[PDB]
From Swiss-Prot, chains A, B, C, D, E:
InterPro entries (alphabetical): Innexin (IPR000990), Pannexin (IPR039099)
Cytoplasmic compartment residues: 1-28, 121-201, 275-358
Keywords linked to the UniProt accession: Cell junction, Cell membrane, Endoplasmic reticulum, Gap junction, Glycoprotein, Ion channel, Ion transport, Membrane, Transmembrane, Transmembrane helix, Transport
Transmembrane segments: 29-49, 100-120, 202-222, 254-274
Top-level taxonomic group: Eukaryota
Protein name as it appears in the record: Pannexin-3
Protein's gene: PANX3
Annotated family: Belongs to the pannexin family.
Length: 358, 358, 358, 358, 358
């Protein structure tokens, strides 16, 4: 089956970076695999089909007179109703899996755009930021051994501030590339377009699916029988039934169940992407209180003004998911205690000797 | 078969950490594989089905007159009983494997939530704890060579306590990150929600399965025959049997055996998850006696107060399964001898020379 | 076939330890694989079955009139004997492989209990014992170079006993952890329960198999023909044979051969597990004579008193199978010469220079 | 299926170099895989064909009289219309997949020419250029430690220009192989021929496909029935139907859908290659402003004159895609800040201490 | 097929030791694979069987009247000859592959006993012997550098014997563990029992196969036709043929060829195992002449007395196959020149400088 190859290349399972949101991953998985699951269920295994169209041939017909009967109607699904001569065609019945696979291949386009048009630049930017930030750490670790003996023999404030103010006017304190780079990117407005188009494309795809199920479906839904004609051409000069009646389709139940499953999964899926859109309409300040005290993280919370549709918002949202990898997963995450000061000076007097790590 | 692909991705077989309990693994395996096993057994291999519905056509009928007979009833399972005109439908018979596969895919949702919503944070926390603990060991191994010559030439107490009390007021004795981190996590209450929801979801799934087997099953259980009608439409203007009687279904035995197997496995499975729930309702203190003497493990047994529903309980339960990997599998596990003191001083006088290992 | 997957996970082929007895391995292999072998032989390859039920339809019947004949009896195996109206059913014939696979999955439960409820604790205990014993060796090898020059220039007894008695009152001679650990385990009585239940479970399983072959089998054993009825319902208003006679089953020979094979293999298998049970009813003292002279092995033979149902007996039995791995496979195994003394002093005078090994 | 082998060798997935453009990759993928996808869909899985030609045999015909009827027309598709005697043949119907596979194998020829006639020379040239450029870096890194102490204690201009002008008249400043090599290649005109032929070949292939669908298709598009003759030879001395009427083809819907899919994909594909052609008609100067200040990159922007059809244009286009691999992905990409000076001297005073990297 | 699994586990392809003789390997391979080869050839591929029993039904019989005819005789192979009423049964025809697979599984029992009851002890013994022998080499290599300068400046005999006689009364010359171990094993008589039983078991198996082919075969060998009866029960009250004549079996040629192949392979196989038995009835002294001069190998040839049925004979036979692995494959194998002395002293004067190897 081609489904094996599709799963082999499509949906088959830098160097540590998380570039895609978990909710985006979930919605991608459901929207991509569900058409494939309906594909596998409808035609294979469960319902051994054989001939999806079944007919009532007259008794006088031989073997492949009736074989022509049965084989000339599946490709010519047309209801010659007596009500003039409106041949109602039954193309949705033979087009169900075709539309399913077309929808499945259509669902993956936003992934293509998000993975080709935005991944390389974002990955390069995050590679630069991780390089500068681990350099920021190893240029700051050198302060924990300068503060193991001089930090002890002095009366608290005039060594917790005298060296801190000396470090304040010292190069290691500031991170100039950080503010300049963050400015040069926050003024940019290119990455938000990819996000908005990647969401709107799947939204309009869902709308098109709704229209497809509303127009071409919902009309032949309780009809399981139709009358065809064999002398719709040169057969007229023959002595047999003038109208081949009751071509019964066998997969009406599968038709109904796949239609209801498709409509239900998309009804339950729609609100999630709307929530994803609304995630970008506000500035996140859940933990802004602790970010304003740290030297490097002060700049992140400082540039919180104006309309929130900026590349800085997207960068921050993707950084919060990567703020706990192996090294940023530190006192930062441990700092759940200052969400409720001269006492903290002697508390961090001991903590600086506690963050020795290796 | 799609079962091959499902087994290829679903249920197919950090860096050493055990994140899932063995009993959870067993219940997951049974609840996930058993629907698949019934799926494979019911339709394939064992019972070569052919046509699951069999009918008694009149003798005058030709080949595909009777083929229409046999093919127009499987999709139209309706009992036109003479008792007005209550068409009892037989949709459970054709919906058995559909419900089976839906239940199989439904069973895996709690695994999804437990593996996406809690695994990364817990794995990061355990990575931090293992890093700090192997550092705690290699900052404590340095005491076994300071105690190879000074430990020998003194009269026992005033070198088994004089150096120990000197080590007591020494930095290597205490583990400040341990108490601060353990506090910052024991006050948290986020991880227990994932556990309780992961259990309650499978519980309500089992309840829904019971309701499904109670309402839609247990009604057509001894019925193997029903009468259908062919002139339920435009067939009325034909000269044949007015009522097509005795559409006999062939898979009644498979129906019964799969129903009984499903109900029995879930009856035998229910109490295990209840036991898993009750595991979190009490504080485990089986070996608390030996934990109170060790320096680092004293804090673990010290914070045993109040209601036991805390993230600390879950962390401890997952740590006891990981307390014997390669290094914590040491004197700790060997210390099965103090579960029944100045003599132990000369016993551990020899033991400190016995724990040289490399 | 599912048999491939079962062999892939079930029965498919620490770090050197032998945790399972060879006789237990043999009985497990025969009791687990034999149902699978009968499964593979009965239904596949050898006897191409086709339709296990064959019927004699009347000549007037068309193609699938007789197809309904043949397909409505396999699922409705009931003998409407003329002797009132005792419908004797033939469910064992269609339940043979179901009972076979149920028995196959049932046979593996004692393995599950023995591998989950006792393996981790026993493995940890043996890991501790091997660590302490190879330490016992490398703290005793240091005696073969102290005895290369002082051992030579003295008149035999007053250096073969003067140093030995000095070593007797020396720390390296005794192994305190050994006696204390052996006491703390010999007083325990938990591991013997797992052994007794693992044997009794397979014993009662064999008894249940005997009951199954005695009640449901041995009754339809020479019957290859039975008469069914088609008008056991709404067929009554039809003109055909009132009683469909001679539904002949084709797999009677396979039925008989599989029944005899199953009963014979279990008759030949029963005494082995009884022998395994009787192995624990006595204290093994075959080589106790050589164990009483060695320092560490003296304690093993010293605690031979009282009723033999103790965890010490099981530990000793599993140790005798592991006493010849790579290092305990030494002079111990070589000491087959003292099973038939001042001469041995000069014999071991040369042997201590012979056990230099590396 | 041979499709598996074709995918195994064709389209199946130096040392880091990117030799093919992403848009070229996309157009290659669509133009190569789409015929294969239509191949797999048309004949396999979806539409279980059986006999693509179906006929109406007379009732008196026996089994393989009508088998000869059905088998002697698929290979002899000829419409003996009464309108003299114009036998219209139906060879497109049996030639659809043959033409599909021929087109699929034809599409890959431009890839063959582009991969054999231009890849080795271009790869060697880029290997030489990467060797000389990483040498250019490691002969320029030596300037960041000569400027760590002498760079500090002087009044800005007379050390930011005195050493720079001394470095200006110093060997490390210039890259003689660069200008000489770039001249020796920019005067060459061999590589542009491969590009233009690789595009024009697929263009004329698309034109030929359009002609094929315009002449041999679009004529038998609504015809599903034709009359053949059996006595078109030695059958004339037989008593049967003089003209075998109504040979109905079953795959008309597949014919129509594959034709429309092929024409639509090529209509949507045509403009992309035209855009690729127009990419080479202009000189790219988007970031020429920053290239004119750098020493080595000044020569790249200096030779921008005359008609743009040169090998230098192709080399530059393939270099811009490779300008961000691991080392050229540096301050170059970071230099997004000078696209909107004595202040920059003190800004780069700090930046030279910021580009220490390892 | 189960043959794939059997080959996967049975016959599918310490740490260098050769524990099984090549002739034993050959006879095992032929005796184990030949039944499997006949199994694969008889039923699969070559002769597409279908129905191994074929019957002549009367013309009036319908489809599955004759299907009952054909299906009720394969399981009821009984010749109702007119000669009273001796029903000759034809069970060998349906029991051929059953007996084949039983014989195949029976052939492997001697391998089981030889691999479980003797392999561990022999492997441990050879591990000890290889450890002591490579120690014997590296305690003897030290003589080739003591004899590089003192060996040169002396008049031959009084340094080729003066040091040799000094080495003669030196510890390195003798190997005490060798004579003591060899005595302790040569007096033992346990391993020869395993060899004799492993040969006698296959001998009696071959005798049983001969009896099986002599009694149950050779009687129905030219009979291809037999007459059965359908009214051997409740069929008597029916109007049809009183005796169903000429049930012709189709696999008589396969029967004959498999019987002849089986008897021929065992006739050609019998003498080899007799030769293997006779191998142990004599003491091998082909190269005893060179063994009596070497120090360690003198003891091997010294204990050649009495009846040859001893464990020492088996140990020597398995050692001669392992005497050329990597180190014993040395001058030993090179010493093919002393099978046809003061001249050899100056020949080995140069040879000791020639055996420097690394």
């Amino acid at each position: 089956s081609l489904a094996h190859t599709a799963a082999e290349y499509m949906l088959s399972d830098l160097k540590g970076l998380r570039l895609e949101l978990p909710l985006d991953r979930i919605v991608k998985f459901v929207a991509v695999g569900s058409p494939l699951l309906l594909m596998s269920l409808a035609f294979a295994q469960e319902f051994s089909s054989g001939s999806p169209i079944s007919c009532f041939s007259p008794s006088n017909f031989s073997i492949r007179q009736a074989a022509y009967v049965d084989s000339s109607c599946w490709d010519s699904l047309l209801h010659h109703k007596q009500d003039q001569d409106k041949m109602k065609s039954l193309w949705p019945h033979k087009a169900l899996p075709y539309s399913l696979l077309a929808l499945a291949l259509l669902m993956y386009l936003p992934v293509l755009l998000w993975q080709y048009a935005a991944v390389p630049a974002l990955s390069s930017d995050l590679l630069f930021i991780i390089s500068e930030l681990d350099k920021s750490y190893n240029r700051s670790i050198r302060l924990v051994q300068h503060m193991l003996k001089i930090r002890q023999k002095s009366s608290d404030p005039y060594v917790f501030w005298n060296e801190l103010e000396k470090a304040r006017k010292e190069r290691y304190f500031e991170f100039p590339l950080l503010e300049r780079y963050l400015a040069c990117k926050q003024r940019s407005h290119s990455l938000v377009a990819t996000y908005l188009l990647r969401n709107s494309l799947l939204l309009i795809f869902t709308s098109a699916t709704y229209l497809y199920l509303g127009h071409f479906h919902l009309d032949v839904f309780f009809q399981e029988e139709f009358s065809c004609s064999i002398k719709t051409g040169l057969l007229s000069d023959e002595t047999h039934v003038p109208n081949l009646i009751t071509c019964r389709l066998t997969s009406l139940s599968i038709f109904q169940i796949v239609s209801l499953s498709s409509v239900a999964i998309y009804t339950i899926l729609v609100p999630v992407i709307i929530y994803n859109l609304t995630r970008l309409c506000r500035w996140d300040k859940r933990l802004l209180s602790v970010y304003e005290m740290l030297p490097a993280f002060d700049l992140l919370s400082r540039k919180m003004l104006g309309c929130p549709i900026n590349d800085l918002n997207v960068i921050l949202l993707f950084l919060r998911a990567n703020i706990s990898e192996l090294i940023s997963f530190s006192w930062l995450s441990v700092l759940c205690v200052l969400k409720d000061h001269n006492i903290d000076t002697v508390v961090d007097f001991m903590t600086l000797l506690a963050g020795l790590e290796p």
